[PDB]
């Protein structure tokens with residue numbers, strides 16, 4: 708049910724990422740570089756296991772998980788969180804919990820583009836990714 712998300716995607720638009728990073732306590736110098744970075748995200752499956760790679764000239768991450776099963780994660784900004792990824796309304800919903808805080812990373816396909824919505828506190832960031840062949 709995750710198959711249309713699979714593949715290699717590149718960032719082509721970003722709105723409010725600085726607000727999102729600042730809400731998470733990311734320092735100004737990291738926000739500055741991040742605001743000019745265009746990651747490539749690779750989403751692959753093997754059976755029930757998804758692997759999500761985020762690559763860039765700055766930070767790089769990789770997670771593997773089963774939908775609906777909690778996993779430990781250490782984020783690009785070094786938060787140690789408890790995570791779960793599920794499908795909800797056709798959207799891939801990633802919830803991170805740490806210190807009583809929460810953030811969601813929600814991916815949906817709209818007109819063939821992958822729209823990533825990042826919410827923490829009041830901050831709502833929308834990042835648009837485009838396929839790669």
Ligand SMILES: CC/C=C\C/C=C\C/C=C\CCCCCCCC(=O)O
Pocket residue numbers: 718728731733737741744746748761762763765766767768782783784823834
């Ligand atoms: C690996 C991500 C690459 C570049 C971004 C660099 C620093 C971002 C700063 C804080 C990380 C916040 C949590 C992760 C955001 C991922 C956004 C995305 O996948 O587009």
Ligand SMILES: N[C@@H]1[C@@H](O)[C@H](O)[C@@H](COP(=O)(O)O)O[C@@H]1O
Pocket residue numbers: 765766767768780781782783784785
């Ligand atoms: N295992 C950790 C990750 O949990 C953390 O996310 C990352 C920070 O980002 P970067 O690797 O780009 O420094 O360092 C390691 O790879």
